[PDB]
Structure formats: C-alpha cells, structure tokens
Amino acid sequence: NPSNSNLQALREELCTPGLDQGHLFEGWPETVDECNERQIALLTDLYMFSNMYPGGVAQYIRNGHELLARESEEVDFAALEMPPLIFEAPSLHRRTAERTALENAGTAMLCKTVFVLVAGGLGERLGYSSIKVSLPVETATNTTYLAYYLRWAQRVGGKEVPFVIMTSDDTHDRTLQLLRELQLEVPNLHVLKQGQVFCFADSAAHLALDETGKLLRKPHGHGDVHSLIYNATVAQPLVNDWLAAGYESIVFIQDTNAGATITIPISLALSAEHSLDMNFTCIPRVPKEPIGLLCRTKKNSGDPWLVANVEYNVFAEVSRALNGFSPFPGSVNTLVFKLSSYVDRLRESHGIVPEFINPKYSDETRRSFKKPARIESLMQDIALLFSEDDYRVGGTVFERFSYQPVKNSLEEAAGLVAQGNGAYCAATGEAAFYELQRRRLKAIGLPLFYSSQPEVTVAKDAFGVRLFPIIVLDTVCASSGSLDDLARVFPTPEKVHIDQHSTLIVEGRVIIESLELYGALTIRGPTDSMALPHVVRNAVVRNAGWSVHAILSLDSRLSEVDRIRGFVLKKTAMAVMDC
Numbered sequence: 411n412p413s414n415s416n417l418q419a420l421r422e423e424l425c426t427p428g429l430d431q432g433h434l435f436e437g438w439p440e441t442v443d444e445c446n447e448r449q450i451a452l453l454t455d456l457y458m459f460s461n462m463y464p465g466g467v468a469q470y471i472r473n474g475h476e477l478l479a480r481e482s483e484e485v486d487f488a489a490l491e492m493p494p495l496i497f498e499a500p501s502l503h504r505r506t507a508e509r510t511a512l513e514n515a516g517t518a519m520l521c522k523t524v525f526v527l528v529a530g531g532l533g534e535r536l537g538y539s540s541i542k543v544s545l546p547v548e549t550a551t552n553t554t555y556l557a558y559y560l561r562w563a564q565r566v567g568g569k570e571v572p573f574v575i576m577t578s579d580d581t582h583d584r585t586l587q588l589l590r591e592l593q594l595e596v597p598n599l600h601v602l603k604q605g606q607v608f609c610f611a612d613s614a615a616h617l618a619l620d621e622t623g624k625l626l627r628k629p630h631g632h633g634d635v636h637s638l639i640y641n642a643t644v645a646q647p648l649v650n651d652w653l654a655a656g657y658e659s660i661v662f663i664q665d666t667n668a669g670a671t672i673t674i675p676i677s678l679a680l681s682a683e684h685s686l687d688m689n690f691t692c693i694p695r696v697p698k699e700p701i702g703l704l705c706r707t708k709k710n711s712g713d714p715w716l717v718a719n720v721e722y723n724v725f726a727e728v729s730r731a732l733n734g735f736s737p738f739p740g741s742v743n744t745l746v747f748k749l750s751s752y753v754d755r756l757r758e759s760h761g762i763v764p765e766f767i768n769p770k771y772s773d774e775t776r777r778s779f780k781k782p783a784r785i786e787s788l789m790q791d792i793a794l795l796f797s798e799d800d801y802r803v804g805g806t807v808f809e810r811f812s813y814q815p816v817k818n819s820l821e822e823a824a825g826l827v828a829q830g831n832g833a834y835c836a837a838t839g840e841a842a843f844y845e846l847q848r849r850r851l852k853a854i855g856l857p858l859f860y861s862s863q864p865e866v867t868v869a870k871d872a873f874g875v876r877l878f879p880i881i882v883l884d885t886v887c888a889s890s891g892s893l894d895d896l897a898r899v900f901p902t903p904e905k906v907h908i909d910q911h912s913t914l915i916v917e918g919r920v921i922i923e924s925l926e927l928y929g930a931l932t933i934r935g936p937t938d939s940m941a942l943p944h945v946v947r948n949a950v951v952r953n954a955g956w957s958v959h960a961i962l963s964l965d966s967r968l969s970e971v972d973r974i975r976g977f978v979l980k981k982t983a984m985a986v987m988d989c
C-alpha cells in the first residue's frame with residue numbers, strides 16, 4: 411500500500427542530517443525497483459511505523475535524540491513534597507464499621523467499573539518460559555492469574571463486564587490460547603495488542619539491526635495502554651460506549667498481583683468520598699524496592715505543582731543529591747480513575763503520555779550501549795495530564811501485605827532476602843495468598859489457630875514459607891470477597907473448626923454452618939450463583955490431607971511452575987462433598 415516512490419522518499423529522508431540512518435542502506439541500489447524483498451521489507455517496515463507511532467520513524471528518531479540528550483544530566487525537581495491528597499485505608503483484616511461502609515460502597519461501585527489488565531510484559535526474570543498471567547495464583551487449585559481476574563470481574567460486574575487486556579507480540583498468542591483453553595466466556599472483553607518500536611544501537615540514535623539484518627524491536631512499555639484504548643472502537647470509540655452504558659470508573663491492574671481484588675473496592679469508595687479524579691494505590695515503601703514514589707512535584711522553578719509517580723530508579727538518582735520507610739508513599743500501579751475525567755484527558759492527549767529512555771551502558775566511561783535501547787513509557791504517567799487546577803489526584807495507602815507481586819526468581823529472591831529485602835517470588839506470592847484468605851476469614855470470626863513457623867524452606871535454605879491451612883473459596887462461593895460476602899459463607903463461624911494442617915476447597919453455591927475438618931475437603935455446590943445453596947451442617951471430616959515438601963537439590967513430573975517456587979504440594983487424600 412505504499413508508493414514504490416514513497417519508500418524512496420522515506421529512505422532519502424532518513425539519510426538527512428539529524429536523522430542519519432544511512433547505515434541502514436549500506437550497499438544498496440539507487441532506487442526501489444532494484445531492491446530485493448528483504449530490503450523492501452525493511453523500507454516498508456520503516457514506512458508503516460507511521461500508523462503505529464505519532465510522526466512515524468522520523469519523529470521516533472527525533473524523540474530519541476531529545477531523550478538521549480537529557481540522559482547525560484541529573485534528574486532534578488525544583489520541588490518535591492508529600493502529595494496533598496493522601497488517604498489511609500482501614501485494615502483489610504478488621505471488620506470495623508468504616509471498613510464495612512467502605513467495602514459496601516466500593517462493592518456497589520464495582521457494577522459501574524471498567525477493568526483494564528496490562529499483560530504485554532515478559533518479566534524476563536523468573537525462570538518461567540510462558541506468560542505471567544498463565545502462572546497459578548496458588549497451586550491448591552492452580553487458578554491462573556488470568557482466570558482469577560476475569561472471574562472476579564464477571565462476579566462483581568456481571569458476565570458482560572467491560573474488560574480490556576493489553577497484550578504484546580511477546581504475550582498475545584499465548585494469551586488468546588489461554589482464554590480459549592480456560593473456556594472463559596467474556597462478551598465485552600477487548601484484547602488490544604501494543605506495537606513494537608525500534609531500538610537504538612547508540613547514543614546518536616542510530617537504529618539497531620540484528621543478525622539476519624532486520625530492524626530490532628521491543629515494546630514501548632505499559633504506557634501504550636491509553637492510546638490503544640483511545641483508538642479502540644466497538645464506528646464508535648470504546649470509551650464512548652462505556653460512558654453511554656453508564657460506566658463511572660476505570661481501573662488498571664498489573665499481571666501478577668492478586669491483592670488488587672481487595673484494594674480496589676476500598677479505593678473506589680475513597681475516590682467517591684474524596685472526589686478523586688485519579689487515585690494511586692499505595693503502600694508504605696522500603697528504601698530499596700522497585701516501586702515508584704507518589705510525590706507532589708515541580709520539575710522547574712516556575713511550574714505548578716503536579717502530583718505524579720517518580721520511579722524508583724529516578725528517585726535513586728534524584729535522591730543522592732537534590733534537597734524505616736520512604737518519605738513518600740510507594741505506588742503499586744493499581745490505578746483508579748473517575749471514568750469521565752479519564753476520558754476527557756484521553757481525548758485531549760490521544761492517550762499519548764510522556765516518554766523516557768533508560769539505556770544500559772556497557773562500561774562506566776563511554777556512551778556505549780551494552781544492548782540496544784528503546785523509548786519507554788509508564789501507564790501511571792498519564793497523571794501528568796491532570797493539572798492540580800482542574801483535577802483532584804490522590805493516593806490511598808494500604809498495608810504492605812496487600813501488595814503481592816510475583817516478580818523475582820528464587821535466586822534473586824534469596825539475594826534480596828539476604829540483604830533484608832522483599833522476595834516477591836512465586837513462593838511468597840502463593841504463601842501470601844493463603845495467609846490473606848485466613849486473615850479475611852478470621853476478620854469475620856472464623857476461629858483459625860495456626861503456627862507462624864515456615865513449613866518448607868526454599869532457595870537452598872535461604873528462607874522458609876508456610877502454606878497451611880489452605881482455604882480457597884471460588885467466586886461463586888465467595889462472590890466479591892467482601893467481609894459481608896464471606897460471612898454469608900460462614901453464618902455461624904464459631905462452629906467451624908479447621909485444623910492448621912487442613913485444606914478446604916469450596917466451589918459454587920455453598921454455605922458452611924458447622925464443620926470439624928482435620929484433613930482435606932472439597933465441597934461443591936450449584937455453579938449457578940442464583941441457585942439454592944448446598945448447606946453443610948455438623949460435618950466431621952478426617953483424612954490424611956495434603957502436605958508440602960521442598961524440591962531437593964538432587965520420569966520427572968516437576969514443571970517450571972513447581973521449580974520457581976521451590977516446593978510441591980502433595981495432594982495425598984481428599985474428601986469430596988457434592989450436590
């Protein structure tokens with residue numbers, strides 16, 4: 411679709427001063443006809459980038475110059491202090507009137523919430539060769555992150571809940587595969603794939619080629635979600651459709667943090683109470699960790715205050731000069747917006763947000779790259795488009811325990827923990843999930859007594875976790891997971907006695923009035939949320955149950971999934987109560 415001469419015009423353009431991409435056409439004919447398909451592919455690839463990126467490859471290159479220039483100086487702000495609008499969430503594990511009030515208000519708002527999942531990233535770190543959303547939240551049920559979010563959203567927002575997943579060339583096909591394999595039926599799901607952008611071989615923004623002689627490419631960061639949304643249609647823009655259907659909020663979540671289903675209702679309630687246009691999910695931050703800081707900022711001496719995330723790496727550089735937790739809250743990138751305000755800023759900017767570049771240098775001396783570098787962007791930087799004059803931007807501070815990402819391999823985690831840092835590995839992610847259920851259930855009066863000692867040690871005796879007792883209630887059973895919803899499952903919790911070594915798995919419409927459990931038990935009820943619940947009374951269950959042991963340093967059934975957590979559950983015995 412591009413003029414054979416239009417390709418020639420772009421090639422000439424790219425050789426001009428300030429663009430200087432001649433090294434791309436080294437040893438080429440004069441015109442387009444004489445070029446092999448492998449050369450027209452590149453020249454075409456360069457031409458098409460225009461519909462993927464504002465100003466095409468020429469502007470990409472200019473932007474690189476502008477960013478790389480800036481990448482020899484020290485980041486600095488004229489001013490930095492605490493954001494004016496910061497609110498502290500009540501504890502997730504105390505059923506106070508306030509918590510009850512916030513959960514109820516927040517849970518009602520879930521009916522009018524659009525959900526967005528950014529899942530284009532690889533997280534090269536883990537020891538896991540498949541996509542992050544295919545990781546199990548926990549291995550008792552092996553429910554994937556993808557299923558976990560989607561089933562929760564359809565539970566709180568109905569089957570027709572609006573749901574966006576951003577994929578990339580790294581995750582797209584496997585994400586569609588998983589959707590199909592899981593038999594997930596989500597009528598208003600939209601899968602939007604972010605584009606690839608070019609890499610710079612050097613500090614002069616010369617485009618990088620690979621071995622086969624083709625242009626090297628990477629995605630442009632989680633920042634692209636806003637433009638994908640802006641350009642998406644359902645001949646009507648997606649966001650118009652949402653607004654017309656009466657949707658009032660939009661929430662952005664990341665690929666491996668199961669905590670979001672707990673924090674989100676509270677954030678919605680507080681946004682409403684405090685009229686927040688944008689509401690950053692925060693936690694108290696420990697000095698070293700890879701989460702940004704929520705700050706009130708002024709980049710230059712004359713500017714207006716601007717509430718925004720300052721990334722950990724940048725705060726690390728801003729810190730050591732310009733003047734047990736950090737002075738400002740840590741931002742975990744569950745982002746909660748008032749939909750109408752979100753859309754207004756989206757329409758103004760076309761979803762375009764500030765960009766940056768962060769080259770990894772080979773040595774400490776030269777502007778020489780250890781690997782090619784591309785321009786990036788952060789989805790949270792849309793905050794910069796919300797002036798303090800026109801908008802209310804704030805943070806809600808939750809318990810650190812509510813932030814449970816799976817980011818690090820066991821070896822990094824051991825290294826992190828050895829320096830007293832957060833592990834954020836698969837083992838602590840699964841263990842945190844089980845403990846979270848237990849804290850919530852105790853909050854409504856379930857008498858769980860259990861040891862705090864670890865039961866298995868991972869990463870060559872670096873640290874231990876514990877798993878038991880394991881209690882996992884599905885979305886039909888637990889509905890939204892609010893404390894009121896959990897109380898519906900256990901109407902008389904003082905009669906339910908689950909031993910510390912037990913496993914209780916509950917699926918479908920179930921009420922448990924009274925139970926003595928020493929062992930493992932699955933209880934299944936009607937999958938139809940609107941059916942007559944299967945009620946359990948005076949149940950007494952005892953069997954060998956389950957156990958856990960470490961994968962030893964030494965017909966193998968161990969998968970990467972087992973290996974990245976360093977232990978395996980042995981699912982020895984299991985009673986089943988169906989009906």
Ligand SMILES: O=c1ccn([C@@H]2O[C@H](COP(=O)(O)OP(=O)(O)O[C@H]3O[C@H](CO)[C@H](O)[C@H](O)[C@H]3O)[C@@H](O)[C@H]2O)c(=O)[nH]1
Nearest residue numbers: 528529530531629630631632664665701702741742743815
């Ligand atoms: O091109 C990309 C890159 C990443 N992602 C997605 O966006 C999230 C990526 O975040 P990372 O886990 O790789 O971590 P970041 O270092 O990008 O940090 C972000 O996550 C942190 C909390 O985990 C803090 O909130 C921080 O301030 C914020 O920038 C994941 O769901 C990932 O799949 C994309 O969709 N496209």
